[PDB]
Design a protein around this nucleic acid. Structure first.
Length: 76
RNA sequence: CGUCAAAGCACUUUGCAAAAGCUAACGUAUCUGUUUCUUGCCUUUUACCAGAAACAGCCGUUUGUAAGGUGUGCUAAUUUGACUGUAUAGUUUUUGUAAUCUUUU
């Protein structure tokens, strides 16, 4: 079987593009490649992009998120 | 170990009460006597032989309680009880996703 942090470890090596959803905000989402992370589920995204229901793709740069705000992490 | 409560504390002397509550050594010990019966050895009764049942004494044991004694402390020490006793800002409770607005009855 596949534990959750070992699954995220694969997303670092493969450098796969991953879109991230927020806690109490469906209107907003994010994108980017995963460089690194930690035990508390904080993430360092590279070439991250802010997306909406309108599809308003707005660029950001290399950012960091708090683990308290995530909900879904999905491949491609 | 920690908290709280009570109390002097440890050691000791007497007094006074108790000690099958659901089959169990108040004493991992153990002796004498009385009465009533049964058998022994016997004729003087006592003194005795060795079984029973029913009562008694004696040598001891434990507990609670009361007053004391010695040594120590009453600017402390010790005992005794009681307790829902631990420390976590990063995902399942105590360091917040909250804040704010509007319509309906």
């Amino acid at each position: 079987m596949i534990p959750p942090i070992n699954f995220i470890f694969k997303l670092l090596q493969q450098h796969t593009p991953v879109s991230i959803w927020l806690f109490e905000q469906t209107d907003i989402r994010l994108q980017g490649q995963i460089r690194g992370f930690d035990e508390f589920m904080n993430i360092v995204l590279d070439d991250a992009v802010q997306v909406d229901a309108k599809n308003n793709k707005r660029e950001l740069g290399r950012i960091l998120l708090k683990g308290d705000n995530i909900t879904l992490i999905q491949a491609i």
